[PDB]
């Protein structure tokens, strides 16, 4: 029936988020915290 | 076109925007709206370095910060009048469960390799008693998938589809009757309780999913 | 006629796992309360773990409801 | 035993127990300091804000 | 350190100081504290009973009318009692039967005095009981 | 604002991805063999 | 006919899960009392963190109510 | 006709649902009493909590017995 | 003929609720005993409150018994 | 062979309900044991209040078995 | 065999009613063990009441087994 | 078949009664163990009492197995 | 059609132990919470042990539901 | 036929008695662990008989299982 | 067309017995957790006792599930 319609179509976001957030999301907080550490020193 | 693409489109449009748009201009001050991430990410890192402590903390902590939000966002469709977290089917947890368990066995097989027979017996029960301990270690490894697979899924599915039962049954709490008064108006108050229950359960279940993932991963990433 | 009602009976029987889950969750809440009273300060280091356990039970409690629903509809 | 309700303190209870236990003994055990343990001449007169040492009742 | 050390130093005259032992079983406030060796970190106010301090030699029994035995993590039992007692002088008949009853005369005093002396009401019975 | 830093998941997250690919293949096979639908 | 009354029996069976909510709803109060006795101070913070669990406890019977209703109407 | 038998049997089976509200109030009273002995200064605070705990606990037993009564008379 | 048989069987099953009251009044009185031993004086406000708890507890078994008697006749 | 059969089966069923006396006795019995363990001097007034509890605890078996005899005849 | 097998079914149904006593007697037994660990000076007097407790607990098992046997022979 | 059907089903129903003994004997054993740990002197004054308590607990389970032994034959 | 009805009946019977699994797991979490409130330093030596235990406690119930699963399809 | 069917059903149902075995195993193991915590030098003191008590509780479950074993057997 | 039906029913009903082991492994885990909280150094000595308890506990549920599936297969 409907098995090959959301399996890959759903896990695509799961595969992509690794390249997306890691260079995109956590980069913001990491750079901000590191810069605030620089001001702390 | 396809309904599944439209379902995933909300994630594809929210994931980039909530960090590339909710912030004012990517400023370090932490906006009032940006206080949300400013509180969430630090608690996330606390557990990430905590639960996966050691040199294994940096191995996949970014993977944790990634994998945590996917299910939480996908289940966010629970409070709409026609709400659907993955069209009441949501085979997605199957994708994230057994594959991650096999990834744990690989972290025992790709990095730990042939030492993989030196983890199922945490403390003792030597050759005179090893098989009994392995008999439950196998069950634990098998069911760790189902503990994070469909568990948050069942919680979300029930907390959302309880509204269907609520509507179908108490359509006539007050619509057309002489019971529209204080007599039966208390039965219709369960819907908001179900909404609060689903809302708390989803977030707590996403956090628990992340924690269970970390607990399973560090067990096969640090052999005792 | 019996085949259809069989699912209704099976769901009713499988839907009795709610009580033990409720008992356990109340137990977790009780221990949290006790730890808060005896140890007012360290309460924060356990409240997160407290919710972690509360969900760790309530998820299976609702899993019982779901397994009943699979026979209920 | 009844130190819980209306006594003075744990020291009062254990000291009365000491007095009785010494009473549960003859002279061949009770040394001289047991006499001062029984003969307590400490005269307790709780003072006040206006330096009112009311009455030096033996402790 | 192996074994178990006891510090039985009452405010009258110190008896034991860290000496090794196999058992120091005593009547705690909530129950019977049979700490034999090592014990665990827990210190209890004590109830009038018998402290059969089982050294490497025989267990000397002395009906002790109170104290607290601090079970320090070093298998040290700091038993800061309030009274001392022998394995022979703490054993008698007439001194343990008439003294409490004569003290029951003091129980005829007012309410707070009787509340205080209620401890002495059963104080002497413990010594005659643990004398064996 | 937005950058693309060098996030290593190619040689770090390779094993989980390989396992997930095997799982997707097994799901495809069960879409024809185990479930026969 | 042969299925509707069976659904009624299934509703009654699903209702027997209310014992979990019942036991928990007062185990929470027991924890509150124990806190009040042991820590009269911390009981103030506990009541906000215990009443919710007592309310959270009732969800166990709430599942019972829903199951019975779907099997009784 | 068998609907009556099924309703009676279902009410009897659901007549086990109030056991939790039974021993529940028991544990509530147990802790309240043990604490009141532990501290009489908490006796006043326990009762303003004991009543709320007991009534709220028995509310579920009342709901389960109402489920039976609907299958008993209604 | 089946209705009377069902009434009898359901009456027997509804008698199961006596277990909860038997344990519950027992727990209340047990707490009274423990509290009296630990704190003799508070028995004055406990034993009356113990009776009140007995009333709030054994009423459950009373309700179950009354329902069972109503169903048996 | 219907009504008498159900009388026998339900009589067997209600007999498990007598198990509540097992906890009815146990709670007060452990209370007395612990009370003597704590304040043995209170053993005099312990059974003085434990007697009423024992009477009300066997009373659960009494009322359930009275219903049981009502069914058995 | 219709009603005789019914007596068999009821007798089997009663046959686990010994659970209440099988837990309550063990409860009184562990209570006595705790008392001895606590008030070891009263173990002999406790046994003169511990036997009574074990009997009053096993009384439930006896009441259950007798009712089971009434339909077992 | 019905005769053997009941002689098997009721047999299985009586058979689960061994649970009560499996809990009861273990409880007494555990209680004696903890008493010895928290009272080394209590081992000598409780070990024969410990065996006696194990017997006093396993009696219900022996009763439970006895009915199955008769039922099968 | 009887086989499918009975498969439904069995799948309704397996899912009761999930109550006990939830009770046990949430009790384990409760005990971890209380022990941590007792010894905050005991977190490292405790939390892994309970995470190992309670996960298996809930896994027992999940595998028990697996019994209902296979008969369900 | 039907007799063997009820034999199978009872063999399945009697297996519920394993709960008492599990709880007894819990009681013995847990209280032994606690006793080891309280008096660490009691581990050797109680190992000779506490393991026997666990074996006794386990043999009770063995007596619970033997009936089902004969049920599959005769 | 019933032996398969009854095998399914019994196989489903067999899942109740593993609840004891599922709650009990967590019970032993709780006791070990508290023991380490009181005494962290006892964790090493109890881990052997922990294996001893876990093996003697989980076997009842494991063999329960194995026997439940075996009578179906």
Curated annotation (Swiss-Prot), chain D:
Localisation: Mitochondrion; Mitochondrion inner membrane
Gene: ATP15
KW Ion transport (keyword) present: yes
Other comment: Present with 4280 molecules/cell in log phase SD medium.
Entry annotated with the keyword Transmembrane: no
Entry keyword set: ATP synthesis, CF(1), Hydrogen ion transport, Ion transport, Membrane, Mitochondrion, Mitochondrion inner membrane, Phosphoprotein, Transport
Signal peptide range: none
Function: Mitochondrial membrane ATP synthase (F(1)F(0) ATP synthase or Complex V) produces ATP from ADP in the presence of a proton gradient across the membrane which is generated by electron transport complexes of the respiratory chain. F-type ATPases consist of two structural domains, F(1) - containing the extramembraneous catalytic core, and F(0) - containing the membrane proton channel, linked together by a central stalk and a peripheral stalk. During catalysis, ATP synthesis in the catalytic domain of F(1) is coupled via a rotary mechanism of the central stalk subunits to proton translocation.
Protein name: ATP synthase subunit epsilon, mitochondrial
Subunit structure: F-type ATPases have 2 components, CF(1) - the catalytic core - and CF(0) - the membrane proton channel. CF(1) has five subunits: alpha(3), beta(3), gamma(1), delta(1), epsilon(1). CF(0) has three main subunits: a, b and c.
A GO-annotated cellular component: proton-transporting ATP synthase complex
From Swiss-Prot, chain E:
GO molecular function: proton-transporting ATP synthase activity, rotational mechanism
Cellular compartment(s): Mitochondrion; Mitochondrion inner membrane
Signal peptide region: none
Domain of life: Eukaryota
Major localization listed first in the record, in broad terms: mitochondrion
Alphabetical GO biological process terms: proton motive force-driven ATP synthesis
Keywords: ATP synthesis, CF(1), Hydrogen ion transport, Ion transport, Membrane, Mitochondrion, Mitochondrion inner membrane, Transit peptide, Transport
Entry protein name: ATP synthase subunit delta, mitochondrial
Gene: ATP16
């Amino acid at each position: 029936f409907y098995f090959m319609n959301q399996l890959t179509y759903g896990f695509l976001l799961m595969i992509t988020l690794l390249i997306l957030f890691s260079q995109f999301f956590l980069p913001m907080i990491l750079r901000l915290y590191v810069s605030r550490l620089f001001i702390s020193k | 076109l396809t309904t599944f693409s439209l379902y995933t489109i909300i994630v594809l449009l929210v994931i980039t925007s909530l960090y590339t748009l909710t912030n004012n201009n990517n400023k370090i001050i932490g906006s009032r709206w940006l206080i949300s991430q400013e509180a969430i990410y630090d608690t996330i890192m606390n557990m990430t370095k905590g639960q996966i402590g050691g040199k294994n903390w940096g191995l996949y902590f970014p993977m944790i910060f990634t994998l945590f939000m996917f299910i939480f966002i996908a289940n966010l469709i629970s409070m709409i009048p026609y709400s659907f977290a993955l069209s009441a089917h949501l085979v997605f947890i199957i994708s994230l469960s057994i594959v991650i368990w096999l990834g744990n066995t690989i972290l025992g097989l790709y990095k730990h390799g042939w030492v993989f027979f030196s983890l199922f017996v945490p403390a003792g029960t030597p050759l005179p008693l090893v098989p009994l301990l392995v008999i439950i270690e196998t069950l634990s490894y098998f069911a760790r998938a189902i503990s994070l697979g469909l568990r948050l899924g069942s919680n979300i599915l029930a907390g959302h589809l309880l509204m269907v039962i609520l509507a179908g049954l108490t359509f006539n709490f007050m619509l057309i009757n002489l019971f529209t008064l204080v007599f039966g108006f208390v039965p219709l108050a369960m819907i908001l309780a179900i909404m609060m229950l689903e809302f708390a359960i989803g977030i707590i279940q996403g956090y628990v999913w992340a924690i269970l993932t970390a607990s399973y991963l560090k067990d096969a990433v640090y052999l005792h | 006629q019996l085949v259809l009602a069989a699912k209704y009976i099976g769901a009713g029987i499988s839907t009795i796992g709610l009580l033990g889950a409720g008992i356990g969750i109340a137990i977790v809440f009780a221990a949290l309360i006790n730890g808060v009273s005896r140890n007012p300060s360290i309460k924060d280091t356990v409240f997160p773990m407290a919710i972690l356990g509360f969900a760790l039970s309530e998820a299976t409690g609702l899993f019982c409801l779901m397994v009943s629903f699979l026979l209920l509809f | 035993s009844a130190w819980r309700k209306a006594g003075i303190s744990y020291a009062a209870y254990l000291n009365v127990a000491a007095q009785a236990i010494r009473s549960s003994l003859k002279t061949e055990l009770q040394t001289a300091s047991v006499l001062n343990r029984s003969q307590t001449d400490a005269f307790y007169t709780q003072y006040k804000n206006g330096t009112a040492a009311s009455e030096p009742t033996p402790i | 350190s192996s074994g178990l050390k006891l510090q039985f130093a009452l405010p009258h005259e110190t008896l034991y100081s860290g000496s090794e032992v196999t058992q120091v079983n005593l009547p705690a406030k909530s129950g019977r504290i049979g700490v034999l060796a090592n014990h665990v970190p827990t210190v209890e106010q004590l109830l009038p009973g018998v402290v059969e301090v089982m050294e490497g030699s025989n267990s000397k029994k002395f009906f002790i009318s109170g104290g607290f035995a601090t079970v320090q993590p070093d298998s040290q039992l700091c038993v800061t009692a309030i009274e001392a007692f022998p394995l022979e002088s703490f054993s008698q008949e007439n001194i343990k039967n008439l003294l409490a009853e004569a003290k029951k005369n003091v129980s005829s005093s007012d309410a707070r005095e009787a509340a205080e002396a209620a401890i002495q009401v059963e104080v002497l019975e413990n010594l005659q009981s643990v004398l064996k | 604002m937005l950058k693309r830093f060098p996030t290593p998941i190619l040689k770090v997250y390779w094993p989980f991805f390989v396992a997930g690919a095997a799982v997707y293949y097994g799901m495809s096979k069960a879409a024809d063999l185990s479930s026969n639908t």
